[PDB]
Tab-separated table of C-alpha atoms and ligand atoms in Angstrom:
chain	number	residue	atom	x	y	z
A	25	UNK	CA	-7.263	82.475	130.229
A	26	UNK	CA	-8.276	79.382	132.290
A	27	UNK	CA	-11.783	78.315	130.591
A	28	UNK	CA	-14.148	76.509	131.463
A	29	UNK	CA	-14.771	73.273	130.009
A	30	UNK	CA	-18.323	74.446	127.676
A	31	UNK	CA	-16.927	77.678	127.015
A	32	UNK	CA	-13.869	75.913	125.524
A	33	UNK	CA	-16.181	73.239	123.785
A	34	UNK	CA	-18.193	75.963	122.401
A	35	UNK	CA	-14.815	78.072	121.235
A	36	UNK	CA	-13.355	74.765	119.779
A	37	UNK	CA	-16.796	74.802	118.101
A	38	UNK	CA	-16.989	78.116	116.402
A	39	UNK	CA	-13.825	77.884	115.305
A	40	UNK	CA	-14.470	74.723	113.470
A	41	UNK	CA	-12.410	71.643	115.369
A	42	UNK	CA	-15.999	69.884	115.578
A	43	UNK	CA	-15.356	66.933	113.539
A	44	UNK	CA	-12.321	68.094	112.467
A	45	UNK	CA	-10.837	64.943	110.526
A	46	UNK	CA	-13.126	63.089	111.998
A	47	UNK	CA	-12.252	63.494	115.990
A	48	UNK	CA	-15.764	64.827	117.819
A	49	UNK	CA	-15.554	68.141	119.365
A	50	UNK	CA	-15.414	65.666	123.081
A	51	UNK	CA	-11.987	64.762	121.857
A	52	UNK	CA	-10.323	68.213	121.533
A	53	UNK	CA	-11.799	69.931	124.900
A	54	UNK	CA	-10.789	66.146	126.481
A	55	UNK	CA	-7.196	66.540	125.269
A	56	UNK	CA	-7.375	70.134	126.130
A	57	UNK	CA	-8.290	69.563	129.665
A	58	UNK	CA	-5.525	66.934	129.937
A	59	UNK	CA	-2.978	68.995	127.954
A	60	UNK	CA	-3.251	72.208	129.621
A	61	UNK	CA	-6.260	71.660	131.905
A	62	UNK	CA	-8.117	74.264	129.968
A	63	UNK	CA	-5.251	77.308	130.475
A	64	UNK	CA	-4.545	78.859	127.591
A	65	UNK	CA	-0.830	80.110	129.013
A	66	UNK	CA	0.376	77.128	129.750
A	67	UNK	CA	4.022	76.152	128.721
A	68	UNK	CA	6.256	72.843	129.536
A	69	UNK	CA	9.047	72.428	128.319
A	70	UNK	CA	10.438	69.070	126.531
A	71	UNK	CA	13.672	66.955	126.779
A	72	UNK	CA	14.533	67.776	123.566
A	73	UNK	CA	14.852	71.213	124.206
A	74	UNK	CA	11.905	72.146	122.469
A	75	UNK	CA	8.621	73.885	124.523
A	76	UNK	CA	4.543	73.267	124.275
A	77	UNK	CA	2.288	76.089	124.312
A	78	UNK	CA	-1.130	76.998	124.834
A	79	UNK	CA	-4.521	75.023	125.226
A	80	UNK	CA	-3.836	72.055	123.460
A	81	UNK	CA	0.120	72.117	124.046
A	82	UNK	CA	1.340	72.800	120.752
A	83	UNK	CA	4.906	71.556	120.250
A	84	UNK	CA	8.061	74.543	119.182
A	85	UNK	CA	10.253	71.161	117.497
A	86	UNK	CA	7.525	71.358	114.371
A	87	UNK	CA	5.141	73.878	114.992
A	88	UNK	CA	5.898	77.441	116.130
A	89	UNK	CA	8.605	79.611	116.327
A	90	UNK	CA	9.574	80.245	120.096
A	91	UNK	CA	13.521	81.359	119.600
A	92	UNK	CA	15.153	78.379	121.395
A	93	UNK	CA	14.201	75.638	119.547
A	94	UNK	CA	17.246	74.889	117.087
A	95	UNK	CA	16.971	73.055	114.116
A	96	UNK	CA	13.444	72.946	114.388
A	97	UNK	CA	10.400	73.772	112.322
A	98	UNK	CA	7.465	76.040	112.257
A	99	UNK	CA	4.754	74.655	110.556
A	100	UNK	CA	1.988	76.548	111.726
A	101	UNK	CA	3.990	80.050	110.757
A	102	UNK	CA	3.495	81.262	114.189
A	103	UNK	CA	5.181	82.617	117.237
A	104	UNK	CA	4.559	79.632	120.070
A	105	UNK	CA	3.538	83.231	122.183
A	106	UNK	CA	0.321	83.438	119.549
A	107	UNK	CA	-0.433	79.819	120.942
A	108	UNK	CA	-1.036	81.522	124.571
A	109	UNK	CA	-3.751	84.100	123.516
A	110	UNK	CA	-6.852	83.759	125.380
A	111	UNK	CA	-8.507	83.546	122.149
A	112	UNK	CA	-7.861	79.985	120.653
A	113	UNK	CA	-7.747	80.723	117.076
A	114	UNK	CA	-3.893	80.523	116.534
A	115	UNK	CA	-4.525	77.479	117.972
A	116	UNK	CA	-6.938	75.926	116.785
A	117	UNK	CA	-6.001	76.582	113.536
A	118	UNK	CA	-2.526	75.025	114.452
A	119	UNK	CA	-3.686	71.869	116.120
A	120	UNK	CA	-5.877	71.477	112.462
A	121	UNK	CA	-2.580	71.137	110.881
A	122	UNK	CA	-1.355	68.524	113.555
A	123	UNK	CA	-4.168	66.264	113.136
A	124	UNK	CA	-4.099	66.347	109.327
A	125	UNK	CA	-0.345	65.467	109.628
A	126	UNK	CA	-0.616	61.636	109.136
A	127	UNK	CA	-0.850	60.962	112.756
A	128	UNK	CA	-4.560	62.547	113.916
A	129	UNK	CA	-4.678	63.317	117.514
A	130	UNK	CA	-2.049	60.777	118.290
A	131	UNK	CA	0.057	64.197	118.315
A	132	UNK	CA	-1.215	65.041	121.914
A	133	UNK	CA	0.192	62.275	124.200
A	134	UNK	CA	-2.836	63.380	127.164
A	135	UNK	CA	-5.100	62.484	124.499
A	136	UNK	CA	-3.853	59.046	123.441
A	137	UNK	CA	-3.408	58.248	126.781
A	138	UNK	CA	-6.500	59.858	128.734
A	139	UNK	CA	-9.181	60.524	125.944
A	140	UNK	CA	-8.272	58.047	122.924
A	141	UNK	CA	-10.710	55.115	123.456
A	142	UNK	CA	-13.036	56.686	126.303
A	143	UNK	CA	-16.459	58.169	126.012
A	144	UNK	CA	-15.544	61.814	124.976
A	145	UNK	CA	-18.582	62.833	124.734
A	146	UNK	CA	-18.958	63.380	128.408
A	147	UNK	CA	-16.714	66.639	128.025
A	148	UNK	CA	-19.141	68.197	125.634
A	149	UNK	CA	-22.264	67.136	128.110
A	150	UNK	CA	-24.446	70.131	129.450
A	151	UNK	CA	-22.940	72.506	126.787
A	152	UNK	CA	-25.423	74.963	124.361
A	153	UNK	CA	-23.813	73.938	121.199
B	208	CL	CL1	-17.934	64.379	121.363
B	209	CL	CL1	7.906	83.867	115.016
B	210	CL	CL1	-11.497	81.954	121.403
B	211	CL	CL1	-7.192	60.012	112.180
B	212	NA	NA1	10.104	75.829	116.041
């Protein structure tokens, strides 16, 4: 599912990544847009072998199983494929893990690099929330 940017704002919302560890709701749907631009199937694959899935381009080295990631982790006890559901909760609840990992959204490199810093709030603007 390709969302639109309130829709995703308000999904992010319901399912609690509003304020998650302190990063306003602006900074997921920003890193989601730059991520994935807002497409819940997307997959690129890393150097290392490794794959990111889903909205917010959640990483197979540490956080899901995918079956071609060896040596790697899977914190989030999920199938990367899970991350790719139109519905976000796999994922959300998966990128709540990330952020509380020492590191907050430092995780997502489009967001330190495109939404870290910048006035996030603009990707929540218009939205019923
Ligand atoms: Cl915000
Ligand atoms: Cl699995
Ligand atoms: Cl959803
Ligand atoms: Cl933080
Ligand atoms: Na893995």
């Amino acid at each position: 599912k390709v969302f639109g940017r309130c829709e995703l704002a308000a999904a992010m919302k319901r399912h609690g990544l509003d304020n998650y560890r302190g990063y306003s709701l602006g900074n997921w749907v920003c890193a989601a847009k730059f991520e994935s631009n807002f497409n819940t199937q997307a997959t690129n694959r890393n150097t290392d072998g490794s794959t990111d899935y889903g909205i917010l381009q959640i990483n197979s080295r540490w956080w899901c199983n995918d079956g071609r990631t060896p040596g790697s982790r899977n914190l989030c006890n999920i199938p990367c494929s899970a991350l790719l559901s139109s519905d976000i909760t796999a994922s959300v609840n998966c990128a709540k893990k990330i952020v509380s990992d020492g590191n907050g959204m430092n995780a997502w490199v489009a967001w330190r690099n495109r939404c870290k810093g910048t006035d996030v709030q603009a990707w929540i603007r218009g939205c019923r929330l």
